[PDB]
A and B are shown apart, each in its own frame.
Chain A
Amino acid sequence: NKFSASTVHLEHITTALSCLTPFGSKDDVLIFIDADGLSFVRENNHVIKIQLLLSRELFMSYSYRNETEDHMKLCVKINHILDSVSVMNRNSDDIVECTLSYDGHGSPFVLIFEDSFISERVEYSTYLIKDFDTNGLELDRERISFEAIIKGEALHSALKDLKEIGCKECYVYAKTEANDENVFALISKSQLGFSKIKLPSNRSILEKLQVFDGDSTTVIDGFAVIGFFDFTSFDKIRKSTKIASKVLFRMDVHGVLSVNILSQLPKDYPGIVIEVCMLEKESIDEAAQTEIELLMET
């Protein structure tokens, strides 16, 4: 066909696909197929967007005979691939071999699974592409207000605690002090009241926290970055943080947050680059930020 990709590491593809389940599990997933690899871009209510990245080195075979077009966009229902790739790859003597292919427009997306003596085949008929631009839910490369690198385990524990305490709303703090002290907390408004989860300033958890002046170059100390995010969208990164070693956090002055999941099988492939862009709430209230500041003071 016009594109073909096979692999045996079904656990990796299953983990990548399970990170798209937090975004519904009963809608459409849009797939890019280019020479670099194949990705799953998923958006909910135009307020949050998640994008996978399965490199070509991840699969043992990646041909991509589509010389005419640089990339191929197809839209299919997400639940079926989630149910299909969950083979768990048991009976290690006979490894279940994956086979992904797509002949082009009108052709269905094929998922052939080979169990040596068994060759099953699933065909997913593609849907018409909705008129939405994935470039809208993207962050600046020149207006970064703050950039933080946080380890996966501490962040995952923080989101788990926030989910357990309800957390109908969430806030983000990012203040850098001139004495090399860096503070980063996830303040939340829940049934309990006002709760704060301060990340430690050690380099084992907060590798690097840099607060900018909206230019992504200046390092201003003593200033605070406030992001008011709905925890409904912020909880979508919890499952993505369960497989990550380090998480990159970047926000700009236009109220978009980019959660960059860095996941660390072949040797050449880097990993699954999972990017979860998120929009900030308007925060019509003005005393709420003052209360956030006062709580962070004492």
Chain B
Amino acid sequence: SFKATITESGKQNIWFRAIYVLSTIQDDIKITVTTNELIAWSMNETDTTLCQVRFQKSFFEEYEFKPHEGVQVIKLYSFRVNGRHLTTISRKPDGDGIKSFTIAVNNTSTCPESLANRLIVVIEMDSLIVKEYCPQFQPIKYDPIIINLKYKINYICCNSTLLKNFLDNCNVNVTDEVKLEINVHRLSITAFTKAVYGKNNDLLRNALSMSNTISTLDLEHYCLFKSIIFKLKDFKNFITIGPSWKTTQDGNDNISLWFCHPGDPILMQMQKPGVKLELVEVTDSNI
């Protein structure tokens, strides 16, 4: 019914760091198979952050889809698989190279019950070792986000190198608030933390703020068609997915942002030649 293969090192790297992030956003990763692309997405338990990756058909050397042979007609097949179980399959072993990563599912009447409701992943190493896994999956119903056309509304385009360095400098253990303060002149991003006070001013939680101001010269494209606050861990992980695939032909290494008000969610979207990446994150409505 579906068969996809990966035969590139960078493609396997981005696939692993794409899935590793969706596994650390939600315990189970929901994957929808389309006729033109493969979509893997993950939603928070609080329904506050969503990351959706879309590996085009050209991203896979072999891409076959036979939905005629659960299924939602909009013919799209969606299934839910454990994120931790999937991220331990796509990991690159040390000392060996994955010459082929095949992801497939054949849900027919002839297929045995040992493979029924069991996702089929076949890995061929450079040492010719064939490692086949059969993780179970649960067919679910895909629900698409209109945010992509809802507010595809000032737009921010900045290179992800310096921002990635700044976010890696920050830690999610003590800081989880990101203030993206942007004006027409400059752009400043500070990772701060509010300090709550106990009974008698006692420091229940301390306040740490690491600020990094970015000049508009480093900024690529901005148009005020602005203070926004959101989380840090989701933004950090979504930032570390595009760099994973070392691509020099596209030369993107940049992120696209959209937000309207402190109430509406902010959309962050990264671009790759065969991979479409987006991050949905709710914003603090405190005006």
Which residue numbers of A lie inside 8 Å of B, CB to CB? 153-154, 157-158, 160-161, 164-165, 191-200, 202, 205, 291, 294-295, 298
Contact = CB atoms under 8 A, between A and B. Distances in A.
Question: Which label, helix, strand, loop or mixed, suits the secondary structure of the B interface?
Answer: loop
Contacts, number: 64
Interface residues of B, number: 22
Contacts of B125: 157
Interface stretch (B45-53, B56-64, B85-93, B187-195): B85-93
A191 B87 CA distance: 13
8 shortest A-B CB distances, which residue pairs?
A200-B128, A198-B130, A196-B132, A194-B134, A192-B85, A195-B133, A197-B131, A193-B134
Contacts of B91: 164
21 contacts: A154-B127, A154-B129, A157-B96, A157-B125, A157-B129, A161-B93, A165-B88, A165-B89, A165-B133, A192-B88, A192-B134, A194-B118, A195-B134, A197-B129, A197-B130, A197-B131, A198-B130, A198-B132, A205-B127, A205-B129, A295-B114
Given A157-B125, A192-B88, 7 more contacts: A157-B95, A164-B88, A194-B118, A197-B129, A197-B131, A298-B112, A298-B115
Interface of B: 85, 88-89, 91, 93, 95-96, 112, 114-115, 118, 125, 127-136
Nearest to A196: B132
Given A294-B114, A295-B114, A298-B112, A161 B85 contact: no
Nearest to B94: A160
Question: Which label, helix, strand, loop or mixed, suits the secondary structure of the A interface?
Answer: mixed
A193 B129 contact: no
Contacts of A158: 129
A200 B96 CA distance: 14
Contact of A191 (B85, B129, B132): B85
A194 B120 CA distance: 10
Contact of B128 (A165, A194, A205, A298): A205
